[PDB]
Structure 1
């Protein structure tokens, strides 16, 4: 079955790399928890 192992503190890091875009997307959320794009 399933088990947990600690991996770190919940902390902001001053030395953090910045990456990734910031897209603005229209989406719908269905009953199964799935997001889908809308146009």
Structure 2
């Protein structure tokens, strides 16, 4: 069986580290909910 435990508040932080690119990808979504690249 699964259970949940709190991890923190839902809040935006101004001292947040900024990372990650912004790629634009053509994908296809199947009936099971899995994404695939085209």
Normalising by the smaller structure, the TM-score range is over 0.9
- TM-score, L = length of structure 1: 0.91
Deviations 1:6-38 (A, max 9, x none): 000000011000001110000000001010011
Structure 2: unaligned runs, 5 residues or longer = none
1: CA distance between counterparts of 2:4 and 2:21?
32
2: CA distance between counterparts of 1:7 and 1:33?
27
Structure 1: unaligned runs, 5 residues or longer = none
How many Å apart are 1:5 and its aligned residue? Answer: 0.4
- TM-score, L = length of structure 2: 0.93
**Runs ≥4 residues deviating over 4 A:** none
